[PDB]
């Protein structure tokens, strides 16, 4: 019980940070970012 009580705030804060990144990559993809001619000319920007 003491172990969980010490890590509860650490764990929920790292999950909120991971979902703020997914929301940013989705609005950034629709906002025209990653569509540039320099992004499609790389091989990892073609997979994205």
């Amino acid at each position: 019980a003491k172990f969980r009580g010490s890590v509860l705030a650490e764990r929920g804060a790292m999950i909120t940070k991971a979902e703020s990144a997914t929301a940013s990559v989705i609005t950034s993809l629709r906002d025209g970012l990653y569509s540039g001619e320099a992004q499609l000319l790389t091989a990892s920007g073609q997979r994205l």
Binding site: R4, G5, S6
Partner: protein, 164 residues
């Protein structure tokens, strides 16, 4: 403090009238009922160590978050007060089956209970988890008679409806 006797002698005292034939008739109903509630008061007062030990950890098997640090029972002196807080409520149910009304549960267990538990941050849902465990644990021919368990289960959800 709230009985069959005390309501009918306070309704007569408020009008300034004698004990009539109405309130003599109502304490006749205290004669036929006290055969059945004084064996629920007797069965509770010799078995109370077992019934508050198994109702106390029905709270903590439903809410194991209360044993976390910073919560309501986080060390052993706060867990031991929770089993004391449950045993205080089961003793006032025993006083209500002896008095025959909701008198001792009102002025010793329920009045001020919402002020104390909101200030000291105690969950009332984990108080009703211990009381509603013993309401469902009661067997009708095994633990008492039929009408002893009607009176035992009626003072238990008086306590549930005052805390919920």
């Amino acid at each position: 403090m709230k009985s069959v006797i005390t309501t009918v002698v306070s309704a007569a005292d408020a009008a300034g009238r004698f004990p009539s034939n109405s309130d003599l008739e109502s304490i006749q109903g205290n004669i036929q009922r006290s055969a059945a509630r004084l064996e629920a008061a007797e069965k509770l007062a010799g078995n109370h160590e077992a019934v508050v030990k198994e109702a106390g950890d029905a709270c903590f098997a439903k809410y194991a978050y209360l044993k976390n640090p910073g919560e309501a029972g986080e060390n052993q002196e706060k867990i031991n007060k929770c089993y004391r807080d449950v045993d205080h409520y089961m003793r006032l149910v025993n006083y209500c089956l002896v008095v025959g009304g909701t008198g001792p549960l009102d002025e010793w267990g329920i009045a001020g209970a919402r002020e104390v538990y909101r200030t000291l941050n105690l969950p009332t849902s984990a108080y009703v988890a211990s009381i509603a465990y013993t309401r469902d644990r009661l067997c009708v021919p095994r633990d008492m008679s039929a009408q002893a368990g009607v009176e035992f289960s009626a003072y238990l959800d008086y306590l549930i409806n005052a805390l919920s």
